[PDB]
Structure 1
Amino acid sequence: SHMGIFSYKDLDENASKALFSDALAISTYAYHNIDNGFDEGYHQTGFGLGLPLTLITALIGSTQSQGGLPGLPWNPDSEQAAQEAVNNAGWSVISATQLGYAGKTDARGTYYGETAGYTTAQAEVLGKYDSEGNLTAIGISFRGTSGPRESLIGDTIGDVINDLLAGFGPKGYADGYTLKAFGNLLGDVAKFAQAHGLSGEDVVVSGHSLGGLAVNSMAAQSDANWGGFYAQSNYVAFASPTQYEAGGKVINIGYENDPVFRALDGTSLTLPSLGVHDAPHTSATNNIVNFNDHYASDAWNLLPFSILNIPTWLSHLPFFYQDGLMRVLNSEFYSLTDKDSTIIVSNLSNVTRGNTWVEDLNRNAETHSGPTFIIGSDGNDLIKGGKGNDYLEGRDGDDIFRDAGGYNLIAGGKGHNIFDTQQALKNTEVAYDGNTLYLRDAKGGITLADDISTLRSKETSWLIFNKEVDHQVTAAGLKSDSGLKAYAAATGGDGDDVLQARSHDAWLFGNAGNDTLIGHAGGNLTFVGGSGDDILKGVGNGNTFLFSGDFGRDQLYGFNASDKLVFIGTEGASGNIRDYATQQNDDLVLAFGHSQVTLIGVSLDHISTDQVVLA
């Protein structure tokens, strides 16, 4: 069973998602929009020939963004925007007075490290209140490397020393960081929480980078310190170089091409620390790609991947974390994801988005396996799936998809979306159920694509060899300059339809409701009952029975040695159909949670591996 890539302990899926959203919000907030100028410059001028312009904007911003430098009156107030965002997520800073904390805070309510050597550490303490004013949860956020704009360089230097000591320091250095920086604070927060009838489980702890380290550190100290109050707290660490994994306390979320993420093995420095370090850790999301201008670029990647290679640090910036991982969380495909799902996140600049395909390059990382999820942006994307099974999500904007094979789901989202086959249309079987486009390639691979207005092919003649041709996707068929080419389909609607296949139908679409789909002597038919509980009457040979997403509870008659079952994007993580099967008298039931299909008069030992696709 799939729990979502950001699944945490034993939480139900929605609780995990909600927690993830809170953690990312407070983790981001700790940086006070320090990378706001970089966000603007990156998107505007990129990471190539425009890089010099990007870097300057990162330092002094514009009238639309604030760089690292404070006090320029033509910049917007990015601190106010930072506070607005965290407050919109449901959080507000709790004051030292509210805590009765005797330590140091600044005018923005930020808490500072308590011990010599840790005084450039920063933490945020926030609360979520009900519409009634009662305290409901507490959030603890640790800042990564950097500090308030007004003391940026000095503070950053302090942090870098702490960073170096985590790799080159005492074995216990990383583990002690949070105890030494915020030992007293955390005690006061515990007393505060308790006075408000809250327990360790009402606390979310997060942070990015060095702040990620700090998350794992608190977790490491939480059984023995603070009366054990934070033992069962929720620890969500972003881009941490370290992992504390004993007791299942922490989830470590980051991008695999972020050289800081998992740079240390546990807390140890190893050879791979200075290079590629993509060995999978139990607590970590090991296969999320930040598909940005650096990652996309062959030229950039002639240089070895390394935390010592400064350009690679692009993938670490907190705005990529905030924006990219929220799209992952909000993805229409989220409930199909697991901790180690291969997820490619589009994070291109405006300079490259229109001429660069977002795809699994698998660069500087262990070989990916399992399905691949590619998450678009709300801009106009070029998205390309591989030869395996892909889940491509366009989101807003006018998106173009390509896919190299296998079994796939595509969500065009809003906008005018194109599916580009990259070859002669005659090489692809195309049908449509009124909403979803079905494409079957020459090897039997099947793609379901929603919100596609145009099917693009590449055609040729004895004269011209690469003409691109668009076909408007209409209910009546594909419309082109050559005319209107209908689908070989019988198509039902919202009702409980009875569909008998006619001579040249190749597809039966029940759509919503409880439909009866009846085959014909010639076989070679694809049955798609759709949602609702459908009856599928297979006749003759070479029939395909296709099921996707929540396909309801179907009954399949007539199944034989020459027929095929295809499940795409369905409940259950197993790739082995035996794991879904139970024999009920003469009937074989393949159960998929809320969906299932009962094959009447069939037993599992009569079904070969060629007859079933789990994708």
Structure 2
Amino acid sequence: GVYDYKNFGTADSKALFSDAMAITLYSYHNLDNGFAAGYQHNGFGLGLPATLVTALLGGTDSQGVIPGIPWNPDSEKLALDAVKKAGWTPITASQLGYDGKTDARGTFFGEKAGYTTAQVEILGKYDAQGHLTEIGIAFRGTSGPRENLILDSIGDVINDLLAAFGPKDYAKNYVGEAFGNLLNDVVAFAKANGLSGKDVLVSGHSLGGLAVNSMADLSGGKWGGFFADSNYIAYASPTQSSTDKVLNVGYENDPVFRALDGSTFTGASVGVHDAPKESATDNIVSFNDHYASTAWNLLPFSILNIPTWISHLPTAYGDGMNRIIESKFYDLTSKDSTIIVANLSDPARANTWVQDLNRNAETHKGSTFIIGSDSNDLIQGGSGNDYLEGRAGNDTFRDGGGYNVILGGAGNNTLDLQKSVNTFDFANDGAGNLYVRDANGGICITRDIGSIVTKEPGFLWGLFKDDVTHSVTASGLKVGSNVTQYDASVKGTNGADTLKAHAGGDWLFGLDGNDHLIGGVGNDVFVGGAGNDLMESGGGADTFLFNGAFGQDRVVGFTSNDKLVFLGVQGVLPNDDFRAHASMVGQDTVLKFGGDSVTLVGVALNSLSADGIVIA
């Protein structure tokens, strides 16, 4: 999964990520709530006010409400209730034995000249008996005195801040200078409750993300090393720690994220700075109104240009990346997967296709994940391999080719093929999967798609020209009484079946259980499904399709003109080819994808070509 952390599993890494996000949002106390709501309802016509940038960098005094930055009057209670819902409660100065200042919200402040406006939330998570189990440390970092943010033009201010993070270890030492003493109190409090450093979660966004990286850098040497094994998840940080301890998460198009190399200012800092980084998620796109807009992108992309900061705002972090967490494709992803998150305003959502424009970014590699919203989306996949997820709402999908999985989700969803129904083949396993094969052989596995739209250059069956809507039914694609039949198939059961293809060729759907799929001399498509399936070509140009937790399969009679298709399987890194998954075991080649495997019986690995083994 994209947010895998240390050696935690997929699932435990997700739970950590979701807590980090939650305490991170809490730390801003809904600063951007009204702005985000305005954007959602109206779009980004009016851009972004410099006062929002200065607020994000310098903090606020307080509370409300601030030009032009709409203020949700319930910001405070909303934010507290949200963090509580995620399991967290602010810990009191008294509980920590902390002699210093906390405000009306319970926020802690920085301790040394230059840091005195920095903020941190110290939160506790408790079991059902009221025993503390986890401590959450959410930094809300600030640039220094607020008053400095308007003594020059906002671009000069940003430029100078960036240039000052690296020299004299300013960034590295930030948390030591700001919260050194408080963190000693936290150690004692943790030990008093039987917790160790592994039980502490550290997060934050923006300058708060810079603080996360700082604490990680300091954790080996300060506070007795207590925090060396703590969990660090930083959002939208300009910096990266020198340690291997921080998961730096951010939107590719967020100009703050990764602006510095470690803490070093470079020629890319005020431009596009999308070079890969080991600690960071490098290819998550916020598909928002700015990103989508020709007008907005006339000027070169730069942190110094305030509209670009739209992609830095915290609400879209929490909303968009929570949708990543919830995705049915989540366990297919890895840290540098290309993921496009639908983040359009309501007006833009109506007529803008969410797609990988690859704007202001290095060329993307590997498969592409496009995650929709809970409303009606227009989603367009590319000519490579795509995983498209509609979620709720009536979603419409387009896709440019390749091998793909399209999940309609809730709603009445549509696949728009943009070409004649005559150029495509359709099959259906009876288990909610509708397969769509293009003229070049690319295959889409689709679910919850009720309608197919085709563009007919002639009068399909002498009746319908131009755009034609077909209904997906058990018996075929229907237009009134007209049916486009599915391809010949043989369907099994969820137990162990023997299925035999006819000489003309069949799709063979084993479904669950350990199946015996006997192909014929025709061109068959073998879908063993779950279980450990034995699949015999029987001649012809056959295709063997593997999705999900597909089991330990054996393929017999595989030749050069046959194809393996791995689509929505485990263990695939961007741009893996089959050699990364292949080994020889005696006379057979074995292809492994996480815990699942295909054995190509009596096939020497050196005889295989990548053209015959599609890894998506």
Query: Which amino acid in 2 is paired with 1:260?
Result: V
Match of 1:180, SS state, is: helix
In structure 1, C-alpha distance between the alignment counterparts of 2:536 and 2:106, rounded to whole Å = 68
Question: Are 1:511 and 2:511 matched, yes or no?
Answer: yes
Distance 1:594 1:168, change over 3 A: closer
Aligned match of 1:449: 446
Q: 1:88-112 deviations in whole A, cap 9, x for unaligned? A: 1111000001111111110110011
Structure 1 contact 420–455 (Cα < 8 Å) conserved: yes
Q: 1:323-365 deviations in whole A, cap 9, x for unaligned? A: 1111111211111111111111110000111100110000011
Question: Are 1:339 and 2:340 matched, yes or no?
Answer: no
Aligned match of 2:546: 547
Aligned match of 1:461: 458
In structure 1, C-alpha distance between the alignment counterparts of 2:203 and 2:428, rounded to whole Å = 46
In structure 2, C-alpha distance between the alignment counterparts of 1:486 and 1:466, rounded to whole Å = 19
Q: CA deviation at 1:145?
A: 5.0
Match of 2:84, SS state, is: helix
Distance 1:223 1:587, change over 3 A: closer
In structure 2, C-alpha distance between the alignment counterparts of 1:553 and 1:36, rounded to whole Å = 49
Per mean C-alpha deviation after superposition, the further-off stretch among 524-533 and 74-83 is 74-83
Q: 1:508-564 deviations in whole A, cap 9, x for unaligned? A: 22222333322222x211111112222322122111111111112222222223211
Aligned match of 1:606: 607
Q: CA deviation at 1:166?
A: 4.9
Structure 2 contact 234–249 (Cα < 8 Å) conserved: yes
Q: CA deviation at 1:598?
A: 2.5
Distance 1:73 1:471, change over 3 A: closer
In structure 2, C-alpha distance between the alignment counterparts of 1:451 and 1:388, rounded to whole Å = 22
Aligned match of 2:293: 297
In structure 1, C-alpha distance between the alignment counterparts of 2:265 and 2:70, rounded to whole Å = 44
Q: 1:24-79 deviations in whole A, cap 9, x for unaligned? A: 1111100001111012101100012x6599x99xx9xxxxxx97449x99954121
Q: 1:381-418 deviations in whole A, cap 9, x for unaligned? A: 11111111111111111111111011111111111111
Q: CA deviation at 1:503?
A: 5.0
Query: Which amino acid in 1 is paired with 2:400?
Result: A
In structure 2, C-alpha distance between the alignment counterparts of 1:406 and 1:126, rounded to whole Å = 47
Aligned match of 1:578: 579
Query: Which amino acid in 1 is paired with 2:457?
Result: T
Distance 1:464 1:479, change over 3 A: closer
Query: Which amino acid in 2 is paired with 1:518?
Result: I
Aligned match of 2:496: 496
In structure 2, C-alpha distance between the alignment counterparts of 1:32 and 1:173, rounded to whole Å = 26
Question: Are 1:265 and 2:261 matched, yes or no?
Answer: yes
Structure 2 contact 35–71 (Cα < 8 Å) conserved: no
Question: Are 1:132 and 2:129 matched, yes or no?
Answer: yes
Q: Which of 365, 374, 381 is 1:369 aligned to?
A: 365
Distance 1:507 1:99, change over 3 A: same
Query: Which amino acid in 1 is paired with 2:601?
Result: I
Distance 1:28 1:157, change over 3 A: farther
Aligned match of 2:309: 313
Match of 1:284, SS state, is: coil
Query: Which amino acid in 2 is paired with 1:559?
Result: F
Question: Are 1:114 and 2:106 matched, yes or no?
Answer: no
Aligned match of 1:214: 211
Q: CA deviation at 1:255?
A: 0.5
Question: Are 1:470 and 2:466 matched, yes or no?
Answer: no
After TM superposition, list the pairs within 5 Å mapping 1:42-81 onto structure 2. 42-48=39-45, 68-69=65-66, 76-81=73-78
Match of 1:114, SS state, is: coil
Structure 1 unaligned runs (5+)?
A: 60-65
Match of 1:351, SS state, is: helix
In structure 2, C-alpha distance between the alignment counterparts of 1:430 and 1:318, rounded to whole Å = 43
Per mean C-alpha deviation after superposition, the further-off stretch among 289-298 and 218-227 is 218-227
After TM superposition, list the pairs within 5 Å mapping 1:92-241 onto structure 2. 92-145=89-142, 164-168=160-164, 170-241=167-238
Query: Which amino acid in 2 is paired with 1:416?
Result: N
Match of 2:317, SS state, is: helix
Structure 1 contact 212–238 (Cα < 8 Å) conserved: yes
Distance 1:379 1:243, change over 3 A: same
Match of 1:302, SS state, is: coil
Q: CA deviation at 1:568?
A: 1.0
Percent of matched pairs sharing the same residue: 59
Structure 2 contact 34–71 (Cα < 8 Å) conserved: no
In structure 2, C-alpha distance between the alignment counterparts of 1:314 and 1:411, rounded to whole Å = 29
Structure 1 contact 112–120 (Cα < 8 Å) conserved: yes
In structure 1, C-alpha distance between the alignment counterparts of 2:448 and 2:242, rounded to whole Å = 43
Distance 1:145 1:36, change over 3 A: farther
In structure 2, C-alpha distance between the alignment counterparts of 1:466 and 1:31, rounded to whole Å = 55
Per mean C-alpha deviation after superposition, the further-off stretch among 30-39 and 561-570 is 561-570
After TM superposition, list the pairs within 5 Å mapping 1:350-365 onto structure 2. 350-365=346-361
Q: Compute the RMSD of aligned alpha carbons.
A: 2.9
Q: CA deviation at 1:373?
A: 0.7
Structure 1 contact 32–78 (Cα < 8 Å) conserved: yes
Aligned match of 1:382: 378
In structure 1, C-alpha distance between the alignment counterparts of 2:272 and 2:72, rounded to whole Å = 38
Query: Which amino acid in 2 is paired with 1:468?
Result: D
Q: CA deviation at 1:499?
A: 2.3
Aligned match of 1:567: 566
In structure 2, C-alpha distance between the alignment counterparts of 1:103 and 1:157, rounded to whole Å = 30
Aligned match of 2:483: 484
Q: Which of 317, 320, 326 is 1:324 aligned to?
A: 320
Structure 1 contact 38–67 (Cα < 8 Å) conserved: no
Distance 1:345 1:533, change over 3 A: same
Question: Are 1:530 and 2:526 matched, yes or no?
Answer: no
Structure 2 contact 505–520 (Cα < 8 Å) conserved: no
Q: Which of 384, 409, 414 is 2:410 aligned to?
A: 414
Query: Which amino acid in 2 is paired with 1:99?
Result: L
In structure 2, C-alpha distance between the alignment counterparts of 1:145 and 1:397, rounded to whole Å = 39
- TM-score normalised by structure 1 residue count: 0.91
Aligned match of 1:282: 278
Aligned match of 1:401: 397
Structure 2 contact 504–523 (Cα < 8 Å) conserved: no
Per mean C-alpha deviation after superposition, the further-off stretch among 464-473 and 328-337 is 464-473
Aligned match of 2:58: none
Match of 2:606, SS state, is: helix
Match of 1:452, SS state, is: coil
In structure 1, C-alpha distance between the alignment counterparts of 2:473 and 2:16, rounded to whole Å = 42
In structure 1, C-alpha distance between the alignment counterparts of 2:112 and 2:177, rounded to whole Å = 6
Query: Which amino acid in 2 is paired with 1:397?
Result: G
In structure 1, C-alpha distance between the alignment counterparts of 2:221 and 2:592, rounded to whole Å = 45
Structure 1 contact 455–472 (Cα < 8 Å) conserved: yes
Q: 1:428-448 deviations in whole A, cap 9, x for unaligned? A: 111111211111112211111
In structure 2, C-alpha distance between the alignment counterparts of 1:260 and 1:376, rounded to whole Å = 24
After TM superposition, list the pairs within 5 Å mapping 1:592-603 onto structure 2. 592-603=593-604
Match of 1:256, SS state, is: coil
Query: Which amino acid in 1 is paired with 2:540?
Result: N
Q: CA deviation at 1:583?
A: 3.5
Aligned match of 2:59: none
Q: CA deviation at 1:370?
A: 0.9
In structure 1, C-alpha distance between the alignment counterparts of 2:209 and 2:465, rounded to whole Å = 50
In structure 2, C-alpha distance between the alignment counterparts of 1:601 and 1:197, rounded to whole Å = 58
- TM-score normalised by structure 2 residue count: 0.91
Match of 2:168, SS state, is: coil
In structure 1, C-alpha distance between the alignment counterparts of 2:147 and 2:455, rounded to whole Å = 58
